[PDB]
Amino acid sequence: MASMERFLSVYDEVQAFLLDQLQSKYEIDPNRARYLRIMMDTTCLGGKYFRGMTVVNVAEGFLAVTQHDEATKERILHDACVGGWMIEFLQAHYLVEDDIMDGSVMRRGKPCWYRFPGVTTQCAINDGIILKSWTQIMAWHYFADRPFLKDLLCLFQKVDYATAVGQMYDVTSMCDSNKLDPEVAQPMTTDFAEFTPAIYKRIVKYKTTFYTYLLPLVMGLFVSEAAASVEMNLVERVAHLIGEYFQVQDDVMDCFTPPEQLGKVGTDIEDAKCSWLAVTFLGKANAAQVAEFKANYGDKDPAKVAVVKRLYSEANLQADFAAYEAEVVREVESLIEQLKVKSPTFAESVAVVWEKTHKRKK
Amino acid sequence: MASMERFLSVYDEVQAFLLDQLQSKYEIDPNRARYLRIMMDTTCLGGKYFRGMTVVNVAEGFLAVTQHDEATKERILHDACVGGWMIEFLQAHYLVEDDIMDGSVMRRGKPCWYRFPGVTTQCAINDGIILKSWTQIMAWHYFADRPFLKDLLCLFQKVDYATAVGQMYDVTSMCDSNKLDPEVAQPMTTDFAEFTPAIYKRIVKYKTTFYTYLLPLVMGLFVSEAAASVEMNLVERVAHLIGEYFQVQDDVMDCFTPPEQLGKVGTDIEDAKCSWLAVTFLGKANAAQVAEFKANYGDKDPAKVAVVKRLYSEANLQADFAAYEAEVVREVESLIEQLKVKSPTFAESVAVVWEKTHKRKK
Ligand SMILES: C=C(C)CCOP(=O)(O)OP(=O)(O)O
Ligand SMILES: C=C(C)CCOP(=O)(O)OP(=O)(O)O
Ligand SMILES: [Mg+2]
Ligand SMILES: [Mg+2]
Ligand SMILES: [Mg+2]
Ligand SMILES: [Mg+2]
Ligand SMILES: [Mg+2]
Ligand SMILES: [Mg+2]
């Protein structure tokens, strides 16, 4: 698909720019430059490119209905690509750190970045951080004179904070709230009392929906100079909804999509995560079922893991999901309908983003 | 100096803002609020506050020799405190991740954040990131309508990026450049050929000088709208020079100052770090002394460690530091003079900053 290639080509632009700058402003040597090139390829490439491509699509849809000089068209499409990449680079930062936090082995069909035979966990922390840093450099280099620079950077920042906070909810979701104390050694939860829809929604809202759906969407508008022509509240509601569904697919896939189709190896069960499956199960399980689940959740032992999976299967969880899916469908279409009022094209962009998301098998 | 008291009470103001915001916008629960309040205090207070206080002292310099209404005088003093905190919070981000990376045990007389009884490394990483991300929230909230905002953010990003690049130089400073390949497992240098002054200088230039000296000084000029009235070039050089010297003291203390007084347990020898002692030692040792060093360096075994220290002691590195120090004093005063040309008062700020650093013992 053309356009996918156009987007990857701007990646080539961004990379050369970044690496040339290391040579000329940062006294980098050829081997570290190479290391940073490979780290950049591994961590930023290989995914679905939903997030960046969404920004490209939102911008295409305003362009098609809107008067610009050809040069303004080119600048907006180029900005679109560059903003998209800022978002793909922000994902890469998230995934690098998160794979460390989650104890994972595989990303995007390759070993996690920290598990690259010649990487080590300790540079990985720092490479992850370099990834975020690159985003700000791109912003400042490419958008230096653009009128959306402030709005873009300030949103970028809030979305990024929201994500960090969500990752905290995420990373401590098997703790008892009443017990969370940096002074005192942290035993995992035994009642699972905090495995509720509400607690679950809060993790997901923050750890995922902002950077995966809100950010791409508004970015497309920012570079398009088109924020005025939509109802921000509507954009916020739809991004939170689709974003939640997205994280739910991901919880489901952690357990039931095999590594070979998925490109990653599940760890939620091993990690005692407050996942949509755990939450949904604990919401419907009987006394016998709750008890076996309590005896097996949160342990690396493949036989225990396997007992949780049998229980998920027995609990007919695939079908609660399809129910959830259908309710989301209803609500998404409803929000798309409401977005047709001000921006029919944004609306259409959202439909496309929804469609892709809806039928990812990732 | 009444100055320290303004600075500290501003923290209280910043902490409350960040914490209350967490409650009203991020749906946080009181336990997590309490976890972040302690994280915030633990990783941000208890330092020597040279960075933050530099930006206060620089701004105070101009208040002294300009004249302003007390309103404006207090808007600048307040801005300088917030600026100063952004810097301290940025150190905090660096120290938390740097402690995990170095596998250290103690920070400012207490366990490293990631080692606190109920903190997991996995969550510590994310705390470290929340800290960076706090600095951006501050900037946008306190400095929204300030005209230095774009300059300030831009600079901040450059300094942070350079700091990440340098941590990369540092944490791969015990590798053979020629053999730094993500795919291939990588043993540590055996020739130590990269243990040079030029390479040392470059590590330290990026990992430390920019955020320790360049940023607090320029930040001061920023909040005082005084950048125009100094020779930026001089600032850059005096910053790079005090900065190198500053890090040399760190390296020396890492080996020679006791935890009791130091506040951290040394680990440069154990981690095979390209410290100023290893490089100064390789620059003067005879063949038998180089060989003993190579046989012993980069290893936790306390005995191997004691050999290196024995070796360092025998070579009067203590001596060499004084030579270096005395040279640094020449160069510094030189640069201070050159700064009295446009900016007598800023030049005094620097001299103050120098004397603090010069005779610290941390
Ligand atoms: C579920 C989330 C939020 C992280 C996984 O992101 P993706 O599945 O979209 O990762 P890519 O491989 O497409 O980058
Ligand atoms: C030398 C560097 C760059 C890190 C240690 O910094 P400090 O020793 O200045 O730490 P504070 O306690 O003053 O924060
Ligand atoms: Mg993960
Ligand atoms: Mg995770
Ligand atoms: Mg997942
Ligand atoms: Mg360290
Ligand atoms: Mg270090
Ligand atoms: Mg040290």
mmCIF file of N, CA and C in Angstrom, chain B residues 3 6-7 10 55-61 63 70-83 223-224:
data_model
loop_
_atom_site.group_PDB
_atom_site.id
_atom_site.type_symbol
_atom_site.label_atom_id
_atom_site.label_comp_id
_atom_site.label_asym_id
_atom_site.label_seq_id
_atom_site.Cartn_x
_atom_site.Cartn_y
_atom_site.Cartn_z
ATOM 1 N N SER B 3 16.302 33.205 50.967
ATOM 2 C CA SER B 3 16.252 32.716 49.634
ATOM 3 C C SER B 3 15.980 31.199 49.697
ATOM 4 N N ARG B 6 12.286 30.658 50.670
ATOM 5 C CA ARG B 6 11.316 30.857 49.574
ATOM 6 C C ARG B 6 11.239 29.616 48.689
ATOM 7 N N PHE B 7 12.422 29.125 48.302
ATOM 8 C CA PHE B 7 12.598 27.929 47.505
ATOM 9 C C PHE B 7 11.880 26.737 48.077
ATOM 10 N N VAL B 10 7.984 27.025 48.198
ATOM 11 C CA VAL B 10 7.469 26.793 46.822
ATOM 12 C C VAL B 10 7.250 25.303 46.479
ATOM 13 N N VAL B 55 19.490 28.726 40.176
ATOM 14 C CA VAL B 55 18.535 29.517 39.373
ATOM 15 C C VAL B 55 17.916 30.616 40.239
ATOM 16 N N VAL B 56 17.741 30.318 41.516
ATOM 17 C CA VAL B 56 17.373 31.364 42.479
ATOM 18 C C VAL B 56 18.452 32.453 42.649
ATOM 19 N N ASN B 57 19.674 32.037 42.917
ATOM 20 C CA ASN B 57 20.764 32.967 43.071
ATOM 21 C C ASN B 57 21.006 33.791 41.784
ATOM 22 N N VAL B 58 20.824 33.188 40.608
ATOM 23 C CA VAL B 58 21.077 33.960 39.392
ATOM 24 C C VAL B 58 20.049 35.071 39.273
ATOM 25 N N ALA B 59 18.786 34.741 39.551
ATOM 26 C CA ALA B 59 17.682 35.686 39.438
ATOM 27 C C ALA B 59 17.834 36.760 40.493
ATOM 28 N N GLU B 60 18.313 36.348 41.673
ATOM 29 C CA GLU B 60 18.504 37.276 42.778
ATOM 30 C C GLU B 60 19.566 38.286 42.442
ATOM 31 N N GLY B 61 20.485 37.875 41.586
ATOM 32 C CA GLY B 61 21.568 38.736 41.138
ATOM 33 C C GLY B 61 21.041 39.954 40.402
ATOM 34 N N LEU B 63 17.754 41.030 40.434
ATOM 35 C CA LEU B 63 16.915 41.812 41.310
ATOM 36 C C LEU B 63 17.781 42.849 42.028
ATOM 37 N N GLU B 70 7.612 45.637 43.759
ATOM 38 C CA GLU B 70 7.724 44.433 44.578
ATOM 39 C C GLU B 70 6.881 43.290 43.974
ATOM 40 N N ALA B 71 5.847 43.663 43.228
ATOM 41 C CA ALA B 71 5.006 42.712 42.524
ATOM 42 C C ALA B 71 5.844 41.875 41.567
ATOM 43 N N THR B 72 6.427 42.546 40.576
ATOM 44 C CA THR B 72 7.369 41.954 39.635
ATOM 45 C C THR B 72 8.526 41.244 40.341
ATOM 46 N N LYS B 73 9.143 41.885 41.336
ATOM 47 C CA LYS B 73 10.231 41.258 42.098
ATOM 48 C C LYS B 73 9.814 39.872 42.598
ATOM 49 N N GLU B 74 8.582 39.749 43.096
ATOM 50 C CA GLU B 74 8.099 38.468 43.585
ATOM 51 C C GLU B 74 7.588 37.482 42.527
ATOM 52 N N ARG B 75 7.129 37.989 41.387
ATOM 53 C CA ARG B 75 6.851 37.140 40.238
ATOM 54 C C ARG B 75 8.112 36.466 39.677
ATOM 55 N N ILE B 76 9.257 37.134 39.768
ATOM 56 C CA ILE B 76 10.489 36.591 39.235
ATOM 57 C C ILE B 76 11.090 35.604 40.217
ATOM 58 N N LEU B 77 11.096 35.997 41.486
ATOM 59 C CA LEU B 77 11.559 35.135 42.538
ATOM 60 C C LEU B 77 10.743 33.857 42.558
ATOM 61 N N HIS B 78 9.431 33.971 42.408
ATOM 62 C CA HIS B 78 8.594 32.791 42.349
ATOM 63 C C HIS B 78 8.925 31.975 41.102
ATOM 64 N N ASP B 79 8.998 32.618 39.930
ATOM 65 C CA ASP B 79 9.377 31.890 38.703
ATOM 66 C C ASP B 79 10.693 31.128 38.833
ATOM 67 N N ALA B 80 11.649 31.728 39.538
ATOM 68 C CA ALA B 80 12.947 31.123 39.676
ATOM 69 C C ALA B 80 12.846 29.907 40.594
ATOM 70 N N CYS B 81 11.944 29.942 41.566
ATOM 71 C CA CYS B 81 11.810 28.782 42.410
ATOM 72 C C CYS B 81 11.222 27.639 41.578
ATOM 73 N N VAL B 82 10.219 27.948 40.765
ATOM 74 C CA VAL B 82 9.574 26.888 40.038
ATOM 75 C C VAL B 82 10.579 26.312 39.036
ATOM 76 N N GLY B 83 11.264 27.213 38.339
ATOM 77 C CA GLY B 83 12.307 26.798 37.418
ATOM 78 C C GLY B 83 13.253 25.873 38.143
ATOM 79 N N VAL B 223 14.197 33.381 33.519
ATOM 80 C CA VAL B 223 13.114 33.945 34.351
ATOM 81 C C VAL B 223 13.310 35.430 34.669
ATOM 82 N N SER B 224 14.544 35.913 34.508
ATOM 83 C CA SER B 224 14.915 37.317 34.729
ATOM 84 C C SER B 224 14.941 38.103 33.435
#
